[PDB]
Write an enzyme that holds these catalytic residues in place. Sequence first.
Site, mmCIF file in Angstrom:
data_model
loop_
_atom_site.group_PDB
_atom_site.id
_atom_site.type_symbol
_atom_site.label_atom_id
_atom_site.label_comp_id
_atom_site.label_asym_id
_atom_site.label_seq_id
_atom_site.Cartn_x
_atom_site.Cartn_y
_atom_site.Cartn_z
ATOM 1 C CG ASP A 71 55.809 32.405 12.947
ATOM 2 O OD1 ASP A 71 56.082 31.230 12.585
ATOM 3 O OD2 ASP A 71 54.797 32.711 13.609
ATOM 4 C CD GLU B 60 57.318 31.929 4.075
ATOM 5 O OE1 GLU B 60 56.321 31.999 4.822
ATOM 6 O OE2 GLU B 60 58.198 31.087 4.241
#
Length: 130
Positions: A35, A38
């Site tokens: 991950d 963002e």
Amino acid sequence: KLHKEPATLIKAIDGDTVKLMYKGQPMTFRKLLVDTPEFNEKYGPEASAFTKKMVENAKKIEVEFDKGQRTDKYGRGLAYIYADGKMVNEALVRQGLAKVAYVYKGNNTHEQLLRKAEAQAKKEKLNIWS
């Protein structure tokens, strides 16, 4: 046993998503077991820049599917991405620009390799881990 397949960069998207031509078709890929932040969070642009450089500057891009489900529900290919033989997923984690994600649907082949890289990044208080 997993195998690498040629792909061609179409467009770098963010830390862990990229668009590639694969088997003659454009497809968006999501990097397995990582991950990245963002873009609108901390290290987001850093992770995006890192991935972008790796994929644009590579002469050979390869995709390696794992043993589990090969697409998420959003239609993204779930793969290990290599630039010039070097795994981008691993590099992100080792650079401390991504954390190791939970296993998704049987796709765990490089989980330990990546947890190893992440422990070292964390030990070095590197980027995400500072």
